[PDB]
Design a protein around this ligand. Structure first.
Ligand code: CA
Ligand code: CA
Ligand code: CA
Ligand code: CA
Ligand code: CA
Ligand code: CA
Ligand code: CA
Ligand code: CA
Lengths: 173, 11, 173, 11
């Protein structure tokens, strides 16, 4: 079974406490991208990894346990294929002309306005996007959709939060 | 090593 | 007016378009912290600068205009004074035992749970906080408190959001 | 120079 197999790999990657900290995550992701020069990026920074751990830390332990890390990794490899798939110029980044497709391929159909804000927050001057940026953007977008669906219990397409819930959802991200 | 495995998941 | 003087200072700091991008912000801040080595920090990262710009970008131009930069700067200098006040052993970082008091001195009074989450996201291994993490944490916390207030036009203490508004607020941050 | 000024705002 693939899951048991991953349990095994995970025991080698997890820290002393058998969860993966933001620093351990950063170190694993960087060793992996380093073997893939065709993926352009300045590296995954510690701030971005702390953010990714936070949005993925649904049981609020402070780090990624096996299930969380497996969920994350599966998305990363699924999204990393789309990346290589839309790097037509094989520039090592997704040109601005291919990003709308890329997001589409990952299953994201988003408004023209929200799309531009995301581009502003994650792309370069050229409007192109590198690897850690593409990946970190997707982990968050994915997490914010799930978060929204999880909070909309009655399924009305609208959620309600008080100041405490709002600060928790936005500061722990 | 576990790194090698993860790295092999990359298309 | 000290504001007219800040206008003169800002004209030397801003980019071609008289606005400060996340990149120009990163360099301005790092040039200032390098001149204060008593403040421990790995430096302000590009990812954190893009996040600080987004969160301060009220008129969504993608960069910080004069009023936004001045607002941001007034907060940074005020918080930097608090950081020196609570680095009581001159270790360069705010120690775990001093952090509760540093946030309150900055005007923030958080319940234990929210506070614990913020510490997991921004503190180092010993639960202490370095300079760029303290400042970026407060910029964000201040922006999220202000965001909730603006949205709670009712005076209710609850805000309601649909999926588009949620992604915009959480992704452009 | 503008950096001198911003630096002087720090304590
Ligand atoms: Ca660990
Ligand atoms: Ca990058
Ligand atoms: Ca966890
Ligand atoms: Ca390309
Ligand atoms: Ca500029
Ligand atoms: Ca602006
Ligand atoms: Ca200290
Ligand atoms: Ca830092």
């Amino acid at each position: 079974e693939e899951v048991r197999q991953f349990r095994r790999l995970f025991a080698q990657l997890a820290g002393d406490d058998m969860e993966v900290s933001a620093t351990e995550l950063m170190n694993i992701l960087n060793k992996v991208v380093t073997r893939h020069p065709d993926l352009k990026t300045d590296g995954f920074g510690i701030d971005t990894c702390r953010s990714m751990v936070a949005v993925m830390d649904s049981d609020t332990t402070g780090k990624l346990g096996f299930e969380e890390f497996k969920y994350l990794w599966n998305n990363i490899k699924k999204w990393q294929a789309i990346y290589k798939q839309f790097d037509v110029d094989r520039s090592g980044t997704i040109g601005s002309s291919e990003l709308p497709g890329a997001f589409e391929a990952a299953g994201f159909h988003l408004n023209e306005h929200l799309y531009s804000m995301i581009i502003r927050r994650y792309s370069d001057e050229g409007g192109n996007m590198d690897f850690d940026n593409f990946i970190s953007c997707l982990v968050r977008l994915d997490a914010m959709f799930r978060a929204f669906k999880s909070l909309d219990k009655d399924g009305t397409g609208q959620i309600q939060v008080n100041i405490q819930e709002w600060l928790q959802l936005t500061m722990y991200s | 090593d576990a790194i090698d495995a993860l790295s092999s998941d990359f298309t």
